[PDB]
C-alpha cells in the first residue's frame, strides 16, 4: 500500500534499490548454508 503511492520515477528507484539489497542477503545466505563444501566459496567475489 506504500508502493502503490509512488510515481514512475520513484518506483524505478525502489525496485533498483531492493535488488541491490536482496543480493547482499541472498549471496551471504548461499555461502553459509547452500554452497557446497568442496568448492571453497568464502566471499562474494569467490561466488562470482
Amino acid at each position: 500500500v506504500l508502493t502503490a503511492g509512488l510515481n514512475s520515477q520513484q518506483a524505478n528507484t525502489l525496485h533498483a534499490f531492493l535488488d541491490e539489497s536482496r543480493s547482499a542477503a541472498l549471496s551471504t545466505y548461499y555461502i553459509r548454508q547452500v554452497a557446497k563444501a568442496a568448492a571453497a566459496i568464502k566471499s562474494r567475489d569467490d561466488l562470482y
Binding site: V1, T3, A4, G5, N7
Partner: protein, 48 residues
C-alpha cells in the same frame, strides 16, 4: 473474486494493484466507484 473498495478497508492484494494501476489512494478509489456506479450499495465489486 470480490474487491472491497470502501474508504476504510485495508483490503487484499487486489485492492493494492487497483491503487498502483490508477495512482490513487483508498479514498479516491471509493469516489471513483461512485462516479462509475451510483447504484452500488456497498464498496465490493466483481473482478470482471
Amino acid at each position: 473474486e470480490e474487491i472491497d473498495l470502501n474508504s476504510g478497508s485495508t483490503g487484499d492484494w487486489r485492492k493494492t494493484i487497483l491503487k498502483r494501476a490508477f495512482n490513487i489512494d483508498d479514498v479516491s478509489l471509493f469516489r471513483l466507484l461512485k462516479i462509475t456506479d451510483h447504484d452500488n450499495k456497498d464498496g465490493k465489486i466483481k473482478n470482471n
